Write a protein that binds this ligand. Structure first.
Ligand SMILES: Nc1ncnc2c1ncn2[C@@H]1O[C@H](COP(=O)(O)OP(=O)(O)OP(O)(O)=S)[C@@H](O)[C@H]1O
Ligand SMILES: Nc1ncnc2c1ncn2[C@@H]1O[C@H](COP(=O)(O)OP(=O)(O)OP(O)(O)=S)[C@@H](O)[C@H]1O
Lengths: 248, 380, 228, 239, 54, 278, 148, 370
């Protein structure tokens, strides 16, 4: 009725491509991050777990963007390549300008202004990509951020991806943690969330993806960890399911 | 339980009240002329097909049965038992006795106005030139048949009127019917829309039968979308008989000996649903619309709708006409009555300026107008 | 259909221009009157709130030291045009050491009253009343959105401008005086406004050749209103 | 016309999309602002904490200069862009003109940007309405408001967002000229406005003031709690 | 349309003369729309008399 | 009565006797006698739904006193929905044989209206006979045409008659409907229909397979845990494929291995790729 | 002659009966060289392909609307009956009038007479015809503006 | 004990509904008539004691008149009583109409006055001033020469009590009343629009000052432009018939019309003009001040433990109808009746508030202005 282009307003006034970009988020890979001090982690779901791929890339959703920041991603894939190139270029231009790493919030607002430049103008497709942010600074420590196709960014401590992850956010609230900064506790919580939310029976470790970010002595290393610790984490969580069925 | 008491003994005395009536339950111009009229006869009216030569030998149909071969009775006028005359035929002698009038259909006489409703020419203000053209259409050829002759021109025997709802079409109709002097005929469009096959066609026949009886008569159509101007037809095959009636109306209306001393006014809110088998001039010769009067007409409609209601003798109508951006006489009269209701909300003897201010609010600014509150300055 | 600044009508015409002339009608009223003694001018503010600070609403702005103005309808097209008129009269004084006369001002404005074109933006939605004192005495000027600029002896704009013109043609002639024209304007004002006339509703702007400076009356306007 | 696009007038003389981009402001969160005589005050409602995040980044009240303060309604991204451009513009005014920035200048810039943004081909209008409160010339407190049309419009108090008619009606039914400010009366006036909010949950209140010489002070919701308690005490004294 | 449509259609038909009927195929698009198939039966079950039918 | 059929004398045209039963061909829309023989117990574990249906239909018939001496109305508007839509018909037939009440199925469609006939086809004269058979329940599959249903809402909504005359609409996919149906003063109990869990799939398995001669050494919860959210449609289908496995053998004996192949007998695709993107 | 409507439950029958007997008496069956078939209709796509079939009505007489000279010829034919003002360029009328039929030009003639009768003119004038053109269309005044 | 009283009242009303000549002159009337009487149609009356009639089969006869009452009462257009012997014109037929006149005539005021809905009394005050004032207190209309309004449209979100307003005005009246669901015209009958219309309004004029109440025809406002390529059915013609019946000719008389719709923009704006229909009334989602009154009415005669506050539920969420409040007040009572308990606590209201409110579900912001 008032469909035609991204511009102009609807008669209430709401937006068309904004709601539909959100509904383009909802059918994508599920991500989350956790509340942790002395480190921060990411979780990700493998789309297309078919047997004839290569996995030689070591990272399909994580993008180690500067040195001490990576980002997960969700949405239309090749727009995210367009976004990651530009994001790396923005942070690297900042480092060129000051010789100090980017303190991550003006990085987030730069990308939000990039996305908003296609929200206002006409006629261009808005970026249908929401994506996460982990990172470290001199001013707040470990951080977590949620980009949105509107240009809004919300600093969370426990985040939200689309229709697959509302029950995940419900579990994050009903299983809210505070004070426990131990990475292994957060990993067990993430294992519990992805066990419930993903429909992978018994949570095959090839269908998941976990990357962490710790502060080591002055380096802020990013640990895109290997598969054996994921296997024993799954075994840990299934032993804790045996503890949960000690109630029978 | 006091309410139980109340309702119980109420209904109990009501039961007594029922028991009251239940226990209290315990020819000269009409009768002696009856058997005299009982040897009369149920003899049928008919309609005559033809006349043979040198003899009646009349063939006849009534309505439905067959086509009846009859005689005449001996005490007839054998001259005028011709075709097109309904006559009375016996149930034993099978012979014509008494003629009858034709199928007059006195529901077609029922659409004639038969009265003169009063809405004066001094009430229809705002359109002093559209009504001037319609005055040229109606009053002048019926009063001064000189200048058509003395210049060699034709009368506009059909005038369509179109425009927004609320405008004055009805007023102009009953206004010329107020000062008519002629035979004025309202036409409900759905007086043509009868049930059975080929009858509204005969309704157009009844119309032209009434028309060509007399002189200078006035057929007034209104709401001809009910008659229709849409030849809406593709592979669905639904409603089409009204279009047959309407094409019959066009046939007997205009082309191959049209009306004569007949002036027809039509009206429609929907001109874009018409048929160009009536849009052609010769049929409809003035496509007169009305439009919204600017301020002078709106002040004039204020004058007409407030000359006969109690107001202050200080109020103007310039500012009130201003706060009617786009409005009609119906909306103006609603403002008058609404301010009257506000005068009933107080206890006044007359109306004031602010009465009509809040009535203008109620009508226009409290119209629905969607959606809805226009609260912005940007202008002032 | 008609849809668009680049399509005529079967009979005329725009239909974008006409909708702009329609868009005039929503504004507040204003009345300016030429008198050989000088140009007077008045307006109604239509104040909404008590918090709505009355001296911040602009209707009469200052173009030159002897050239006044009034606006109508849309506010921001008027803000653009006022800005440009200020810049260009200053340019005339720059390259000529003299005052750009009021007809030349309004020619400079209506050079791009219609330069509307989005390719090769929209037409403006404002009527303007110009008063000033050139070498030919006082001048009163009226333009439109379509740039069809004309001189007027006593023009009224915006809302209820018809009866303003009618009752103005009732009272006006050629040899009026100043104060008579002032009260002759504000009588029409408190016939076309809805509220009671007081100190905060209206504002005057009078320019005289010997009183070129200060084209305004400030709260002696109270004394003028109480004389009716 | 039609509701498409920004360039066509209505058949009765309107622009649909200017009235329609005000509706997104009309359907936003509330934020008020008054001027006292020496201290200026404003604040937003609807902190709307979702139990699991930080909120120091979602702040709707910021500043462009050391003298001026912001507020908005509508959608927040246009507020982010307009605030970003306003900082640059205020600093560029500081570049040439060596004054502290007058409030009237930055409001003319915002409204001018907003209108030349609205005129052009298919640029979506900024669905915000800002409140620009400041005191520069001899410490004279001023507050102006904006509009999607781009009309800066000086007031003495203001209410925007959802149900602003009731809130401004409270400033109409309160708004006493006496006395004076009296910062205590301005503080209590903020307390009465926030008690007169559309919800007035008691914990969703966020207010910040400026005493026309200092910088912005973000309060603590215990001082505001005692403020609500003494407002309730005066309400009991009404009985 | 007219050298290979309606003309030059009845060449050998003039010579053969067995069961040469016409169907202009407007007579099947009926009023009671399922009379279409009934008139298909009425086409064939009236045709197969002149035994090699056309 | 007004509108009363009668018997006429055939020599002087006087009345003979009243012809009662004003009923038009609308018991031919009722069509409820011998619906099935009674089947309450055949539901796999939706007992909360059945208890709410009992205390929305029969409890208003049993104890209207206990509503209105407690001073509340009795609920009449029941919409049934589930996200797949299963058990949508069997629960109707289940309720239908356990109430001893004039049940009615109007599971047809918005037919005639102006196509070969007059129209007035949802409850137009059906409510007259809901009066004529005063305890009654109406059932429908189902938003589709736009004035008839509206008329008949306004016959059903409040201003109708003595209640205990309930309507059951039962379909999937709520959001395809108009803007008048979902009034809560018009539909008073909207119950969801979840696809079942492991225990309820086990129960439905027991229900259908109880007449199926299952051999020995046969576990069933394993079959239930071979079901990744089976709605109840294919739960019947697994048992029918097990019966087909017994039929293709000339046997009457079913092992658990038959179900191990029968679960495998159900999988469809929706395979294609170069479409992950997203 | 109706397109045979492809719908059930009802139908007027004698339209088909008179149609079949009209085509029967007309052409095909009972041919005769003393039938001169004249017929005129508004629209064509209501009709049946059996109404022509090979030559039932083989001669088609369409009518393009009057091109240039016919219009002023028609206006001259209608103005022949009246008190002509003989300084009326009918070719100017043909230059300005477009997409008009014979009947609309007759209406121009009658409305020009009546518009002259509004001032009671003895003979007509040219802008009487021009306002006849405007009033035949809808009307105009002119308002006028933007034409200065 | 009161139930015995109400049953006896209803059965005695039925008894009263069951409680509903000449020794030889009436027998002569019985021979002035043939007992199988019939219904005919006068075409003309040649007044010399024999008339011409018309039958439902169409046989039209010179039939003699047998007057007991004044025989000049019946007219051409009025039916007669004809025999089967000679179809003798018997006499007095009081003018009867269709069966579909008593169908649309409610004979009761089964519900109650303005004390039934909770709080809208600005526009309830309007319909008050436009029906209750012109009927009962018709002073100032004559006494200031101003005519009362005629048409009232109800609209807004559904379930506001449009039906409740209808039946409330159907209480407080002495004028005769009619109940018409006006969408009943779905036939395959050409014509037959004006039959119901003309007979309805003729009946309305013949009885009394009355209200002619059309209810829910918001679908039938068919856009006033066409039907698309082929449409025309009858529906436009029937609504145009009603339009001409309302504000054409033939002066309206003392006839009132109140109308109600759910959606309003899909109507026909050839009706919504004033004069044709005068008043329009918004019924929106009210407030949080008369929700207290709607809960007050719905907790008038129910067993509520007064510890609980319904104002907590009113403070919870703010946009829902009064019908939703009725659904909650009954549903929490059922939740109390789970286990044979006396009164209702808070959590039954909580579960019932959640239960009834499964209506609005969208999605996904906004939510995100923000
Ligand atoms: N100049 C006027 N003076 C007085 N009343 C007027 C005037 N113009 C219009 N009216 C009102 O308009 C009515 C006549 O116009 P209409 O009733 O709208 O004709 P109409 O049949 O209703 O048109 P439509 O399109 O069919 S609804 C009058 O009865 C008044 O209510
Ligand atoms: N509770 C249950 N107990 C036993 N069988 C069930 C149950 N629910 C569903 N089924 C079976 O699964 C199927 C689904 O039930 P139905 O309601 O009849 O089908 P349906 O798809 O729901 O019909 P619709 O939705 O009205 S078209 C039936 O064949 C039942 O045998």
């Amino acid at each position: 009725r008032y469909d035609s282009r991204t511009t102009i307003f609807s008669p209430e006034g709401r937006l068309y491509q904004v709601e539909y970009a959100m509904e383009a988020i909802g059918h994508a890979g599920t991500c989350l991050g956790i509340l942790a001090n002395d480190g921060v982690l990411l979780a990700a779901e493998r789309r297309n777990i078919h047997k004839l791929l290569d996995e030689v890339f070591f990272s399909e959703k994580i993008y180690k963007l500067n040195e001490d920041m990576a980002c997960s991603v969700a949405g239309i894939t090749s727009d995210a390549n367009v976004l990651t190139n530009e994001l790396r270029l923005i942070a690297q231009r900042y480092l060129l300008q000051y010789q100090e790493p980017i303190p991550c919030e003006q990085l987030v607002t730069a990308l939000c202004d990039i996305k908003q430049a296609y929200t206002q103008f006409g006629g261009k497709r808005p970026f249908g990509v929401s994506l996460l942010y982990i990172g470290w600074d001199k001013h707040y420590g470990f951080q977590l951020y949620q980009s949105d196709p509107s240009g809004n960014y919300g600093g969370w401590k426990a985040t939200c991806i689309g229709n697959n992850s509302a029950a995940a956010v419900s579990m994050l609230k009903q299983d809210y943690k505070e004070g426990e900064m131990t990475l292994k506790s957060a990993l067990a919580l993430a294992i519990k969330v992805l066990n419930k939310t993903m429909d992978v029976s018994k949570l095959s470790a090839e269908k998941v993806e976990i990357a962490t970010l710790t502060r080591e002595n002055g380096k802020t290393v990013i640990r895109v960890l290997k598969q054996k610790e994921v296997e024993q984490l799954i075994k840990k969580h299934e032993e804790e399911e045996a503890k949960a069925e000690r109630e029978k | 339980q006091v309410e139980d008491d109340i309702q119980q003994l109420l209904k109990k005395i009501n039961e007594l009240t029922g028991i009251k009536e239940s226990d209290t339950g315990l020819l000269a111009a009409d009768k002696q002329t009856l058997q005299s009229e009982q040897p009369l006869q149920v003899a049928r009216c008919t309609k005559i097909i033809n006349a043979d030569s040198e003899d009646p030998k009349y063939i006849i149909n009534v309505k439905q049965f067959a086509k009846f071969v009859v005689d005449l009775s001996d005490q007839v006028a054998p001259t005028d038992i011709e075709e097109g005359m309904r006559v009375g035929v016996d149930r034993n002698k099978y012979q014509i006795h008494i003629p009858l009038p034709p199928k007059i259909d006195p529901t077609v006489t029922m659409m004639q106005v038969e009265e003169k409703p009063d809405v004066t020419y001094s009430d229809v203000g705002g359109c002093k030139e559209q009504i001037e053209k319609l005055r040229e259409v109606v009053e002048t050829p019926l009063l001064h048949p000189e200048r058509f002759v003395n210049l060699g021109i034709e009368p506009p025997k059909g005038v369509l009127l179109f425009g927004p709802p609320g405008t004055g079409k009805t007023l102009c109709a009953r206004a010329v019917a107020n000062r008519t002097d002629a035979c004025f005929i309202r036409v409900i469009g759905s007086e043509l829309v009868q049930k059975y096959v080929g009858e509204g066609a005969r309704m157009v026949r009844e119309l032209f039968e009434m028309a060509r009886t007399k002189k200078a008569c006035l057929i007034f159509f209104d709401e001809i979308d009910a008659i229709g101007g849409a030849r809406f037809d593709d592979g669905a095959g639904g409603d089409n008989e009204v279009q047959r009636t309407m094409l019959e109306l066009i046939n007997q209306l205009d082309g191959f000996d049209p009306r004569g001393n007949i002036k027809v006014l039509m009206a429609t809110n929907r001109p874009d649903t018409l048929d160009p088998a009536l849009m052609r001039p010769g049929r409809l010769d003035r496509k007169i619309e009305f439009s919204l009067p600017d301020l002078e007409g709106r002040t004039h409609i204020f004058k007409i709708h407030a000359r006969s209601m109690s107001v202050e003798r200080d109020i103007r109508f310039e500012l009130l006409a201003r706060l009617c951006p786009n409005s009609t006489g119906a909306e103006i009269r609603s403002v008058c009555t609404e301010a009257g209701m506000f005068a009933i909300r107080a206890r006044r003897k007359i109306a004031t300026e602010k009465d009509f201010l809040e009535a203008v609010n109620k009508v226009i600014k409290s119209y629905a107008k969607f959606s809805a509150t226009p609260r912005y300055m940007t202008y002032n | 259909y008609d849809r668009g600044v680049n399509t005529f009508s079967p009979e005329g015409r725009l239909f974008q221009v006409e909708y702009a002339i329609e868009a005039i009608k929503l504004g507040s009223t204003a009345i300016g009157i030429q008198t050989s003694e000088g140009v007077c001018l008045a307006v109604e503010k239509r104040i909404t709130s008590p918090l709505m600070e009355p001296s911040s609403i602009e209707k009469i702005v200052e173009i030159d030291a002897h050239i006044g103005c009034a606006m109508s309808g849309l506010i921001a097209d008027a803000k653009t045009l006022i800005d440009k008129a200020r810049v260009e009269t200053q340019n005339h004084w720059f390259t000529y050491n003299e005052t750009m006369t009021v007809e030349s001002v309004t020619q400079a404005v209506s050079n791009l009253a219609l330069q509307f074109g989005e390719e090769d933006s929209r037409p403006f939605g404002v009527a303007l009343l110009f008063g000033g004192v050139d070498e030919k005495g006082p001048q009163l000027f009226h333009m439109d959105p379509s740039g069809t600029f004309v001189q007027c002896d006593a023009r009224a704009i915006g809302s209820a401008s018809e009866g303003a013109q009618s009752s103005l043609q009732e009272v006006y002639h050629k040899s009026m005086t100043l104060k008579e024209a002032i009260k002759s304007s504000l009588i029409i004002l408190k016939q076309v406004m809805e509220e009671k006339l007081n100190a905060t509703n209206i504002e005057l702007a009078t320019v005289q050749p010997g009183q070129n400076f200060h084209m305004f009356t400030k709260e002696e306007l109270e004394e003028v209103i109480k004389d009716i | 016309s039609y509701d498409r696009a920004i360039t066509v007038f209505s058949p009765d003389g309107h622009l649909f999309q200017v009235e329609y981009a005000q509706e997104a402001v009309k359907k936003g969160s509330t934020a008020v602002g008054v001027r006292g005589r020496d201290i200026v005050v404003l604040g937003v409602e609807k902190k709307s904490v979702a139990k699991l995040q930080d909120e120091r980044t979602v702040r709707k009240i910021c500043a462009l200069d050391d003298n001026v303060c912001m507020a908005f309604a509508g959608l927040t991204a246009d507020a982010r862009i307009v605030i970003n451009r306003a900082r640059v513009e205020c600093q560029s005014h500081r570049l040439t003109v060596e004054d502290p920035v007058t409030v009237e200048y930055i409001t003319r810039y915002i409204a001018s940007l907003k209108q030349r943004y609205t005129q052009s081909n298919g640029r979506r209008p900024f669905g915000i309405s800002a409140l620009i409160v400041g005191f520069d010339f001899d410490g004279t407190p001023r507050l102006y408001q904006t509009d999607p049309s781009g009309t800066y419009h000086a007031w003495k108090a203001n209410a925007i967002g959802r149900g602003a008619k009731s809130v401004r009606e409270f400033l109409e039914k309160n708004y006493t000229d006496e006395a004076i400010e009296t910062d205590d009366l301005t503080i209590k006036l903020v307390i009465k406005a926030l008690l007169e909010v559309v919800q007035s949950g008691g914990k969703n209140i966020e207010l910040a003031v400026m005493r026309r010489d200092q910088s912005l002070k973000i309060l603590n919701p215990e001082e505001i709690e005692k403020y609500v308690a003494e407002i309730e005490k005066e309400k009991e004294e009404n009985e | 349309p007219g050298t290979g449509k309606t003309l030059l259609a009845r060449a050998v038909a003039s010579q053969l003369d067995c069961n040469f009927l016409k169907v202009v195929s407007s007579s099947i698009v009926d009023k009671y729309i399922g009379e279409s198939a009934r008139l298909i039966r009425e086409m064939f079950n009236y045709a197969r008399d002149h035994q090699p039918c056309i | 009565t007004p509108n009363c059929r009668v018997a006429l004398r055939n020599d002087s045209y006087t009345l003979h006797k009243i012809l009662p039963n004003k009923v038009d061909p609308l018991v031919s829309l009722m069509m409820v006698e011998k619906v099935p023989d009674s089947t309450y117990e055949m539901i796999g574990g939706l007992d909360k739904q059945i208890k709410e249906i009992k205390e929305v239909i029969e409890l208003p018939v049993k104890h209207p006193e206990l509503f209105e001496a407690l001073g509340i109305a009795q609920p009449k508007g029941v919409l049934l929905y589930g996200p797949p839509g299963t058990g949508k018909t069997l629960l109707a037939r289940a309720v239908a044989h356990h109430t001893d009440c004039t049940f009615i199925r109007v599971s047809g469609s918005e037919l005639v209206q102006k196509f070969i006939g007059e129209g007035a086809r949802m409850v137009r004269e059906l409510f007259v006979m809901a009066r004529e058979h005063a305890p009654s329940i109406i059932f429908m599959d189902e938003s589709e045409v736009q004035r008839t249903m509206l008329e008949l809402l306004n016959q059903l909504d409040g201003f109708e008659a003595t209640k205990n005359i309930k309507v059951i609409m039962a379909t999937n996919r709520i959001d395809i409907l108009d803007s008048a149906l979902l009034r809560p003063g018009r539909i008073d109990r909207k119950i969801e229909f979840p696809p079942p869990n492991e225990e309820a799939r086990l129960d439905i398995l027991k229900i259908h397979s109880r007449k199926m001669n299952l051999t020995r050494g046969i576990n069933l919860r394993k079959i239930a845990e071979l079901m990744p959210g089976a709605s109840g449609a294919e739960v019947k289908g697994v048992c029918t494929e097990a019966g087909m496995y017994a039929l293709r053998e000339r046997r009457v004996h079913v092992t658990q291995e038959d179900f191990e192949m029968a679960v495998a007998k159900v999988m469809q695709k929706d395979s294609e790729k170069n479409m992950s993107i997203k | 002659g109706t397109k045979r409507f492809d719908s059930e439950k009802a139908g007027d029958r004698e339209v088909q009966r008179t149609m079949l007997e009209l085509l029967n008496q007309l052409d095909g069956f009972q041919p005769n060289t003393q039938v001169k078939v004249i017929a005129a209709t508004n629209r064509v796509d209501i009709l049946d392909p059996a109404l022509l079939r090979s030559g039932r009505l083989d001669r088609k007489i369409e009518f393009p609307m009057p091109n240039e000279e016919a219009r002023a010829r028609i206006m001259q034919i209608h103005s022949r009956k009246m008190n002509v003002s003989p300084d009326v360029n009918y070719e100017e009328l043909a230059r300005c009038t477009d997409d008009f039929n014979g009947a609309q030009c007759k209406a121009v003639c009658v409305e020009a007479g009546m518009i002259a009768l509004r001032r009671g003119a003895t003979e007509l004038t040219h802008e009487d015809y021009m306002e006849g053109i405007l009033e035949v269309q809808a009307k105009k005044k002119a308002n006028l503006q933007y034409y200065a | 004990l009161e139930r015995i009283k109400d049953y006896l009242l209803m059965e005695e009303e039925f008894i009263r509904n069951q409680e509903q000549k000449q020794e030889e002159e009436r027998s002569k009337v019985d021979d002035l008539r043939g007992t199988p009487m019939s219904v005919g149609t006068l075409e003309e009356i040649i007044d010399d004691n024999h008339a011409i009639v018309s039958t439902s089969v169409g046989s039209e006869h010179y039939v003699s008149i047998l007057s007991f009452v004044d025989k000049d009462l019946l007219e051409p257009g009025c039916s007669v009583l004809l025999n089967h012997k000679v179809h003798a014109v018997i006499g007095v037929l009081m003018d009867d109409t269709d069966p579909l006149v008593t169908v649309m005539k409610v004979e009761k005021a089964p519900q109650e006055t303005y004390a039934d809905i909770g709080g809208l009394d600005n526009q309830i005050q309007e319909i008050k001033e436009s029906v209750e004032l012109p009927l009962t207190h018709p002073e100032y209309y004559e006494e200031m020469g101003i005519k009362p309004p005629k048409g009232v449209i109800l609209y807004g979100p559904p379930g506001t009590g449009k039906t409740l307003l209808a039946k409330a005005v159907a209480n407080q009246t002495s004028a005769t009343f009619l109940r018409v669901v006006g969408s009943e015209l779905i036939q395959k009958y050409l014509g037959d629009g004006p039959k119901l219309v003309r007979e309805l309004f003729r009946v309305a004029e013949e009885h009394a000052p009355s209200i002619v109440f059309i209810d829910e025809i918001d679908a039938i406002g068919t856009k006033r432009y066409d039907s698309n390529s082929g449409g025309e059915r009858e529906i436009q013609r029937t609504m145009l018939e009603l339009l001409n019946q309302l504000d054409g000719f033939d002066s309206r008389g003392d006839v009132k019309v109140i109308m109600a719709t759910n959606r309003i923009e899909t109507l026909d704006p050839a009706l919504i003009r004033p004069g044709r229909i005068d008043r329009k009334i918004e019924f929106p989602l009210p407030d949080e001040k008369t929700k207290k009154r709607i809960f007050q009415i719905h907790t008038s005669r129910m067993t509520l433990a007064d510890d609980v506050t319904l104002d907590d539920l009113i403070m919870a969420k703010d946009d829902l109808s009064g019908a939703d409040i009725k659904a909650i007040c009954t549903e929490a009572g059922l939740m109390a009746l789970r286990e044979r308990r006396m009164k209702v606590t808070n959590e039954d209201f909580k579960k019932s508030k959640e239960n009834v409110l499964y209506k609005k579900q969208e999605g996904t912001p906004e939510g995100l202005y923000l």
